Design an enzyme around this catalytic site. Structure first.
Site, PDB file in Angstrom:
ATOM      1  N   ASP A 109       0.836  -1.191   0.000  1.00 59.76           N
ATOM      2  CA  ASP A 109       0.000   0.000   0.000  1.00 59.76           C
ATOM      3  C   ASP A 109       0.876   1.248   0.000  1.00 59.76           C
ATOM      4  O   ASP A 109       1.807   1.363   0.804  1.00 59.76           O
ATOM      5  CB  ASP A 109      -0.936  -0.008   1.211  1.00 59.76           C
ATOM      6  CG  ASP A 109      -0.187  -0.022   2.532  1.00 59.76           C
ATOM      7  OD1 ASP A 109       0.130   1.068   3.053  1.00 59.76           O
ATOM      8  OD2 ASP A 109       0.089  -1.127   3.047  1.00 59.76           O
ATOM      9  N   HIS A 147       4.781   4.238  -3.394  1.00 59.87           N
ATOM     10  CA  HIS A 147       5.511   5.441  -3.776  1.00 59.87           C
ATOM     11  C   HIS A 147       6.047   6.212  -2.575  1.00 59.87           C
ATOM     12  O   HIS A 147       7.012   6.969  -2.724  1.00 59.87           O
ATOM     13  CB  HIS A 147       4.614   6.343  -4.626  1.00 59.87           C
ATOM     14  CG  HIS A 147       3.193   6.389  -4.160  1.00 59.87           C
ATOM     15  ND1 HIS A 147       2.222   5.538  -4.646  1.00 59.87           N
ATOM     16  CD2 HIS A 147       2.574   7.186  -3.257  1.00 59.87           C
ATOM     17  CE1 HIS A 147       1.070   5.807  -4.059  1.00 59.87           C
ATOM     18  NE2 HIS A 147       1.256   6.803  -3.211  1.00 59.87           N
ATOM     19  N   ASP A 197     -10.685   0.489  -0.798  1.00 60.12           N
ATOM     20  CA  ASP A 197     -10.590   1.878  -0.374  1.00 60.12           C
ATOM     21  C   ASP A 197     -11.510   2.824  -1.129  1.00 60.12           C
ATOM     22  O   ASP A 197     -11.764   3.928  -0.635  1.00 60.12           O
ATOM     23  CB  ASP A 197      -9.146   2.387  -0.516  1.00 60.12           C
ATOM     24  CG  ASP A 197      -8.260   1.955   0.634  1.00 60.12           C
ATOM     25  OD1 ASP A 197      -7.531   0.951   0.481  1.00 60.12           O
ATOM     26  OD2 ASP A 197      -8.302   2.610   1.695  1.00 60.12           O
TER      27      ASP A 197
END
Ligand SMILES: OC[C@H]1O[C@H](O[C@H]2[C@H](O)[C@@H](O)[C@@H](O[C@H]3[C@H](O)[C@@H](O)[C@@H](O[C@H]4[C@H](O)[C@@H](O)[C@@H](O[C@H]5[C@H](O)[C@@H](O)[C@@H](O)O[C@@H]5CO)O[C@@H]4CO)O[C@@H]3CO)O[C@@H]2CO)[C@H](O)[C@@H](O)[C@@H]1O
Ligand SMILES: OC[C@H]1O[C@H](O[C@H]2[C@H](O)[C@@H](O)[C@@H](O)O[C@@H]2CO)[C@H](O)[C@@H](O)[C@@H]1O
Ligand SMILES: OC[C@H]1O[C@H](O[C@H]2[C@H](O)[C@@H](O)[C@@H](O)O[C@@H]2CO)[C@H](O)[C@@H](O)[C@@H]1O
Lengths: 1526, 67
Positions: free
Chosen positions: A533, A536, A668
């Site tokens: 999750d 980045h 999500d």
């Protein structure tokens, strides 16, 4: 079997992109191991690195790679291994990289710089995908169906979970994604993990209890498993955080956040005394915010002492100025600004008198002034006594220093409270967010930015909690010192979690790295992969280390990541270094129907009819290569990557876009019920499942749950309600993808067309191998938009079959339970009425939708393109090698080349080149004309190109390829090549029109590669094993040697004749030129191995000897033009080149030719019996030239008058030649003559130059005498071996001179006549009139010519003598002279024909110039500036020879201590050929031009491919080969 | 200023480069091939402890003529 990929490298070591797939990653295709083979039995893949020959990287070059040498060796990121690059100037080097285990691998190159230093290229990565099997059945990566399930909503028991497993197994998912199954934290959010090293005590207790559950999922339901892995944070209440508080950023580890710590706890204390101090507790008034914000300004913002964190303590610095005023003992520098510049003096103190860490954040008063240096500046600027206005000056300076800090403070504070009253509204006032509860201890006015606790070391800490900046760069650690987000309150925090401070490595957080390592390899032992999750936000070096630890435990680790970095390039770099196998894409992000169609278009595949890659004219074709003679050495059980054709050039490795995992809905994003409607769940999931990638869905999407489940609060359990909503359809979609996954492999094997019309979205999935396909019509339900009717669907050359159709309808609202999560009741109605009309004539299928097709419905059709079966690819990729079995080096010319004028010769002017509409004609009529155009089309997949348009509009170009060879059917092997093209083009015409261009370029490209390979096999070894550049030069030999109908080299027959250049020198009297033929004879015929063809040209011209001269214009041996004095000596030089190279070449001297011209130089008796009269051996032909020149020749040209040259003057026809025996060199010519290669005769009447030659080279020419010396040396050693019988030479009077004396006469007088000494004193020996001179240190261009200044002109003709007669030159004189030509006369591709500093220098050639310029009009410029390419060949051949003899840096010891050229000389040689390699690469004609304007400027009148332009460069490669490569 | 080979003439002020193979254990040996008698000199350039460039004296040696 054969699992090898070819990765070609550039001259700088960078990988070459074989196709333009976009921004991508060098990914290797996911394939199962061979039958019954495990990891370690054999290399999974072998990457063949191809380094160009002579490239700058090859100079002491080494290939570095972190690939382990064998399966026993573990993988280390930073342990690279050596590999030696075998340098060669001809042959490219191939270095294999055997890979035994999937993972991340990189390679870089080290080489010797041109500064003799060490240099390194970038690191270039490539990923080997993991192998995913369930029991023993391989799971292709693009057939993965992932079901994401949350642990705490599946029941408190293991069997309560295995009921959910059976439901997703019925829907035929093959992979399950788990939210982390670890002990959860205080808020019980799945991502705030209490303890990483043990699982949830509610369900599990040990590793073996959860490992058995995952292995049970594998054996029972055939389902793999993977979990989330959290690197960025941990729960705010971990018992190990008490022991190791340094694992996060605290006031010790990250001191810059000390300012933000005190702001958080001051706001939390204001929440305790909120209405106790003022009044607004939790009201919904706009004023209530403002009044509470005014309490924040006065009770917390105004209570931190104006923030000395930025500002220097002013009075506490003056106090610390009187305390030791005296240790500071003035200054001596004079750079201090005066009080006039009140700002430059302010920052001058900032640079000299500051403690470390100035300007940056730290403790309360971290920024301070070095007192000892500050007072020294004050004393030297004002006074040494303190009371002399220092308190005013020191305060004035410090106040100016804090001016940027104060404005840095006002800009910070404004963002602190502006961020506050913007979130508190959304946090409380119902703009779109609820929970406006009076400020509680759990719900204060400020979300906790820092987690406070008392550690096991007794001290108190403040570890913060990560989150996300609104629109900030995720690559920047917002907790690091580079960000001010925690201070300016620009952080949306997660109170459930807490920082995890990784450093540059394990040295900054030892226990954190050790704990995360054991936590990573714990889940790696159990599960098949990971899910990351917000990947980045995890630092690269952090993600790289742990993912490699996991792959050491589980070599087949499958990595998924939600990666949304700054751009696609950053996305690819993360996939490159981390080894990410798939990127998460969300279908719910599409706001409208057009955004959804564009998302599906990105991950659907390539357009229908996309071009297929083939090796063309940009590859090396080694004659010693293995071949699949009928494309049959493949077995399906081997699972080997296939070559492109019968030639075994392995499959190229090119960057492809990173693989995607398309999620119709994650855990999500909001529910389709929320963002759109519930009916859209059916068409949305169908469009995603049709994409050619991995797909996934969250549990509840198929079960149409009402709203997105709160991962934090909700405790209800999944329903046991089976087969609800789309569960029936997902079973169909996943079962259909299982059938498709068996045969679809690479990116070129799955094609797609997508259309969007209003609320409908059309998806057409197509397999490019067999033609099988699916057609999906999905009506989307983003909103109740009303009734819309879709137009008639039309499929060309395709048949359709109804598969299934469904509609999703809502039956009221969802039940409201408090212990179980139940979805909305939905009806799944099967639809009918789809009319599939098929036109048995046009082969077109029409599809009409029924009016009962509501929004939220789909319909799937099975389709099959007509004319395509599974056996189509094998028929096209086979037979071409056997078809070219009987081709010859002459017959290939008709298959590949032939200019339109050359084709008009065979077709009497009827055929020619195919005319492409809206484009033009190909450069050649053969395959080279097509390949030159198709290479850029295939690279860009330009289906809109005019040739691509024409290929699908009709079968004209298809039949043009086959019908051409009727002109040359009788030639060797052409008939069988035509039949292979006929059989393959016939099968192509039975395909749909839109597929013809891709298959047309494939058939042409395959036969082209087989023709080019057949050429390299028929040629010699030096050519058949060299670089693309050398083979491309060798292919020019085939372009020039062809049999014709309008001309030849023999007057009786029509045989192969070398053309001067295409297309301007190929037909009738313009084709053969004796001067042009024998300059290129050694390069195009001897270097290539065309021995018998080189003999034919020597014998054919031997028949036309006259006046002791070889004619330039050869009219096939009938009435040839004897206006050349150059040809006879280039001809005799080619005879020497033949005897030297050809084994047994001395047999040429006794070959008898039929002398078809009388010995007494008679007229033109072409039909007389005295033509075939007498014979003449080559031995006496050579002597006839040497003796006739010496005995004197005197004649006027036969048939003299205008009927020959309609501009040459009357006196111009009487040329002549004799030898000055005081020097021994050959003179000849006049001012009305063109007897040399610079034979441009003026013709401009407006410029008054008709009959005036632009470059008459009367007298002693350097090339003529240089070849004369080479001929004398040749016959002298030949007489020593008993092969030449003649030594006598007659003089006009009657005198005799031995051949050795004439040879010595030149040796004693050549350099004396031509050399112009740089020493002004040595002018008394080399015969020089210093008045007419240009540059000294130059070898003359002419001796005693008509105009004396033309003698002392810098021209590239002297290099011909340097190459053929090096004994005539002292080394130091020649080396300096050829160095001047390199600096002055050397152009990029061509050699300047005249010194630019000369007054006659006009380097632009225009054969159409109609002006009054006496020098430029009508092309008189031809040899007065323009850059010719063949002179470059003779130049660099002697440039290599004399730099090897003179310069000591150009030599190195070697075999038998024999001196071979150093890499310093090869480097200088390689650099002077880059423009030549670029030219033949980026030219429609596959050769080198004849002429070039000034400084590489393209000359339109110049012939684009010339015989001697490429042949002289082949001469250089043979010199370096025949003398060193032994 | 020693010419690299007999073909190269002697110049007083044209010096040629030679690389010193640095090692902490092994000394480096660099040969100077002399083909003709005359005056020859040599000096050394290195990186100073101030990271600057420094040069030593010119050290001469004479090759006597052959009579
Ligand atoms: O069929 C019998 C033939 O007999 C006679 O031939 C003569 C030519 O008519 C006459 O012009 C001449 O040909 C010369 C030429 O003058 C000479 O300069 C040289 O060739 C040059 C051209 O001068 C130069 O302009 C250029 O021409 C190229 C051009 O650049 C290119 O872009 C393209 O347009 O093709 C042109 C050539 O066709 O380059 C060439 C090559 O460097 O040598 C030529 C041959 O000696 O003298 C001929 C003597 O036989 C009749 O006059 C002729 O009509 C008859 O057809
Ligand atoms: O309508 C004419 C037709 O022919 C065109 O050009 C080519 C032709 O395809 C070849 O068969 C050749 O032999 O003749 C012409 C060139 O000389 C176009 O290709 C075609 O599209 C056009 O309609
Ligand atoms: O007739 C043309 C003329 O061109 C060149 O003249 C040179 C001259 O020789 C040099 O002294 C130079 O400095 O001035 C001219 C070019 O700017 C050729 O050198 C000469 O031989 C030739 O006749």
């Amino acid at each position: 079997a054969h699992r090898t990929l070819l990765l070609r490298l550039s001259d700088s070591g960078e990988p070459v992109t074989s196709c333009s797939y976009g921004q991508g990653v060098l990914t290797l295709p996911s394939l199962p191991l061979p039958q019954g083979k495990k990891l370690g039995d054999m290399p999974v893949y072998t990457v063949k690195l191809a380094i160009p020959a002579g490239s700058p990287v090859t100079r002491d070059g080494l290939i570095w790679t972190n690939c382990p040498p064998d399966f026993s060796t573990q993988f280390d990121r930073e342990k690279f291994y050596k590999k030696i690059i075998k340098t060669s100037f001809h042959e490219d080097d191939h270095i294999d990289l055997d890979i035994y285990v999937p993972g991340t691998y990189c390679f870089y190159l080290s080489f010797k710089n041109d500064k003799d230093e060490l240099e390194t290229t970038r690191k270039f990565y490539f990923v080997v995908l993991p192998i995913l099997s369930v029991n023993d059945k391989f799971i292709p990566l693009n057939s993965i169906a992932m079901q994401s399930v949350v642990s705490k909503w599946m029941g408190p028991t293991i069997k309560d979970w295995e009921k959910v497993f059976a439901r997703v197994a019925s829907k035929k998912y093959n992979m399950i994604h788990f939210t982390p199954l670890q002990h959860r934290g205080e808020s019980n959010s799945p991502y705030s993990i209490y303890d990483q090293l043990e699982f949830d005590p509610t369900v599990f207790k040990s590793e073996k209890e959860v490992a058995d559950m995952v292995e049970r999922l594998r054996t029972e339901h055939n389902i793999l498993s993977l979990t989330d892995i959290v690197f960025n944070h941990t729960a705010n209440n971990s018992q190990w955080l008490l022991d190791h508080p340094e694992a996060g950023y605290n006031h010790k580890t990250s001191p810059h956040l000390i300012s933000a710590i005190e702001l958080d706890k001051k706001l939390l204390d204001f929440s305790e005394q909120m209405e106790a101090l003022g009044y607004p507790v939790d009201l919904k008034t706009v004023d209530d915010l403002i009044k509470v914000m005014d309490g924040i300004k006065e009770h917390v913002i105004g209570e931190l002492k104006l923030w000395e964190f930025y500002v220097v303590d002013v009075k506490q610095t003056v106090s610390e100025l009187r305390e030791k005023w005296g240790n500071s003992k003035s200054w001596s520098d004079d750079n201090i600004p005066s009080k006039d510049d009140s700002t430059n003096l302010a920052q001058f103190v900032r640079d000299n008198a500051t403690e470390p860490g100035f300007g940056s954040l730290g403790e309360r008063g971290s920024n301070k002034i070095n007192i000892d240096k500050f007072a020294a500046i004050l004393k030297k600027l004002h006074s040494e006594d303190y009371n002399n206005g220092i308190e005013e000056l020191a305060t004035k300076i410090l106040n100016d220093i804090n001016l940027p800090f104060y404005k840095e403070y006002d800009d910070d504070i404004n963002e602190v409270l502006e961020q506050l009253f913007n979130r508190i509204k959304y946090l409380r006032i119902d703009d779109h967010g609820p929970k406006q509860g009076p400020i509680t201890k759990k719900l204060p006015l400020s979300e906790p930015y820092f987690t406070r606790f008392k550690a096991k070391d007794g001290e108190e800490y403040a570890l913060a909690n990560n989150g996300a900046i609104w629109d900030g760069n995720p690559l920047v650690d917002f907790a690091s010192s580079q960000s001010k987000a925690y201070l300016r309150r620009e952080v949306i925090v997660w109170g459930d979690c807490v920082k995890l401070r990784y450093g540059k490595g394990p040295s900054d957080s030892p226990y954190l790295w050790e704990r995360m390592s054991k936590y990573v390899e714990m889940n790696a032992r159990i599960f098949n992969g990971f899910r990351i999750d917000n990947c980045h936000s995890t630092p690269l070096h952090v993600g790289q280390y742990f993912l490699d630890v996991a792959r050491r435990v589980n070599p087949n680790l499958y990595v998924v990541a939600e990666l949304f970095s700054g751009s696609e390039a950053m996305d690819c770099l993360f996939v490159e270094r981390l080894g990410i196998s798939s990127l998460i894409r969300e279908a719910m992000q599409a706001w409208s129907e057009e955004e959804l169609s564009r998302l599906v278009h990105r991950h659907g595949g390539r357009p229908i009819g996309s071009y297929k890659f083939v090796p063309l004219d940009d590859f090396p074709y080694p004659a010693d290569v293995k071949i699949d003679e009928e494309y049959c050495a493949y077995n399906p059980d081997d699972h080997s990557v296939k070559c492109v054709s019968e030639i075994m050039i392995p499959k190229t490795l090119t960057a492809t876009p990173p693989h995607a995992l398309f999620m119709d809905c994650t855990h999500d994003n909001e529910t389709p019920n929320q963002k759109r409607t519930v009916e859209d769940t059916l068409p949305n999931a169908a469009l995603v499942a049709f994409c050619s990638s991995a797909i996934g869905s969250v549990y509840g999407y198929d079960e149409v749950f009402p709203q997105l489940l709160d991962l934090v609060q909700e405790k209800r359990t999944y329903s046991c309600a089976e087969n609800t909503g789309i569960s029936k359809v997902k079973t169909l979609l996943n079962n259909m993808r299982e059938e498709i996954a068996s045969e679809a492999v690479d990116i070129e094997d799955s094609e797609m067309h997508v259309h969007h019309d209003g609320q409908y979205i059309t998806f057409h999935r197509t397999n490019a191998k067999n033609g099988k396909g699916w057609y999906l019509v999905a009506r989307t339900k983003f909103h109740s938009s009303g009734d819309q009717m879709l137009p008639r669907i039309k499929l060309s050359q395709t048949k359709a079959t109804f598969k299934a159709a469904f509609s999703l309808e809502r039956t009221g609202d969802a039940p409201i339970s408090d212990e179980i999560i139940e979805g909305i009741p939905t009806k799944l109605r099967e639809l009918t009425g789809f009319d599939i009309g098929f036109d048995e004539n046009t082969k077109e299928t029409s599809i009409l939708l029924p009016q009962d097709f509501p929004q939220g419905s789909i319909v799937i059709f099975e389709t099959q393109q007509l004319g395509i079966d599974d056996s189509l690819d094998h028929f096209i990729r086979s037979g071409a090698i056997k078809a070219t079995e009987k081709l010859s080096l002459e017959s290939i010319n008709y298959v590949l080349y032939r200019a339109e004028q050359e084709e008009y010769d065979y077709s009497e002017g009827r055929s020619g080149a195919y005319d492409i509409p809206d484009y033009g004609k190909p450069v050649y009529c053969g395959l080279q004309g097509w390949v030159s155009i198709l290479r850029k089309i295939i690279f860009y997949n330009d289906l809109a190109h005019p040739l691509s348009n024409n290929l699908r509009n009709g079968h004209w170009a298809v039949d043009y390829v086959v019908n051409r060879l009727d002109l040359y059917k009788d030639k060797e092997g052409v008939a069988e090549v035509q039949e292979w093209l006929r059989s393959r083009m016939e099968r192509i015409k039975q395909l749909p029109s839109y597929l013809v261009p891709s298959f047309f370029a494939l058939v042409v490209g395959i036969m082209y590669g087989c023709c080019r390979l057949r050429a390299m096999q028929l040629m010699s070894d030096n050519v058949g094993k060299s670089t693309v550049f050398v083979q491309s030069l060798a292919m020019t030999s085939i372009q020039m040697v062809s049999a014709m109908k309008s001309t030849s080299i023999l007057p009786d027959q029509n045989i192969a004749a070398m053309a001067a250049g295409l297309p301007h020198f190929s037909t009738n009297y313009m084709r053969c030129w004796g001067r042009d033929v024998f300059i290129s004879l050694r390069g195009l015929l001897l270097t290539t191995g065309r021995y018998e063809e080189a003999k034919e040209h020597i014998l054919a011209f031997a028949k036309t000897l006259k006046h002791g001269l070889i004619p330039n214009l050869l009219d096939a041996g009938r009435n040839p033009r004897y206006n050349a004095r150059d040809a006879a000596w280039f001809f005799v030089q080619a005879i020497q080149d033949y005897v030297t190279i050809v084994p047994g070449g001395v047999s040429l001297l006794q070959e008898k030719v039929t002398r078809r011209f009388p010995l007494d130089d008679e007229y033109i008796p072409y039909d007389d019996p005295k033509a075939f009269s007498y014979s003449s051996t080559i031995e006496e032909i050579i002597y006839e030239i040497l003796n006739r020149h010496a005995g004197g020749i005197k004649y006027r040209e036969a048939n003299a008058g205008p009927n020959l040259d309609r501009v040459m003057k009357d006196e111009g026809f009487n040329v002549e030649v004799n030898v000055d025996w005081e020097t021994g060199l050959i003179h000849g010519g006049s001012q009305f003559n063109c007897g040399t290669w610079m034979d441009k005769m003026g013709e401009s009447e407006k410029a008054n130059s008709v009959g005036v030659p632009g470059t008459p080279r009367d007298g002693a020419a350097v090339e003529i005498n240089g070849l004369l010396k080479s001929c004398l040396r040749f016959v002298l050693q030949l007489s020593k071996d008993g092969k030449f019988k003649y030594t006598e030479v007659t003089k006009p009077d009657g005198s005799k001179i031995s051949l050795s004396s004439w040879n010595d006469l030149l040796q004693e007088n050549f350099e004396r006549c031509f050399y112009v000494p740089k020493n002004k004193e040595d002018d008394n020996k080399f015969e020089i009139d210093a008045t007419i001179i240009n540059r000294r240190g130059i070898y003359k261009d002419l001796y005693r010519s008509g105009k004396p200044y033309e003698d002392y002109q810098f021209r590239p003709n002297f290099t011909i003598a340097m190459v053929v007669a090096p004994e005539l030159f002292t080394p130091d004189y020649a080396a300096g002279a050829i160095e001047l030509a390199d600096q002055v006369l050397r152009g990029p591709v061509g050699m300047r024909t005249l010194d630019p500093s000369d007054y006659n220098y006009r380097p632009y050639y225009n054969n159409g110039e109609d002006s009054d310029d006496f020098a430029t009009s009508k092309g008189r410029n031809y040899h007065q500036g323009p850059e010719w390419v063949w002179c470059y060949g003779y130049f660099i051949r002697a440039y290599h020879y004399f730099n090897f003899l003179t310069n000591p840096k150009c030599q190195v010891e070697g075999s038998a201590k024999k001196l071979k050229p150093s890499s310093y000389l090869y480097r200088k040689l390689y650099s002077r050929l880059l423009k030549h390699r670029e030219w033949i690469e980026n030219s429609p004609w596959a050769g080198l031009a004849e002429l070039t304007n000034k400084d590489g400027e393209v000359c339109n009148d110049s012939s684009p491919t010339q015989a001697w332009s490429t042949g002289c460069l082949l001469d250089l490669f043979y010199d370096l080969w025949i003398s060193y490569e032994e």
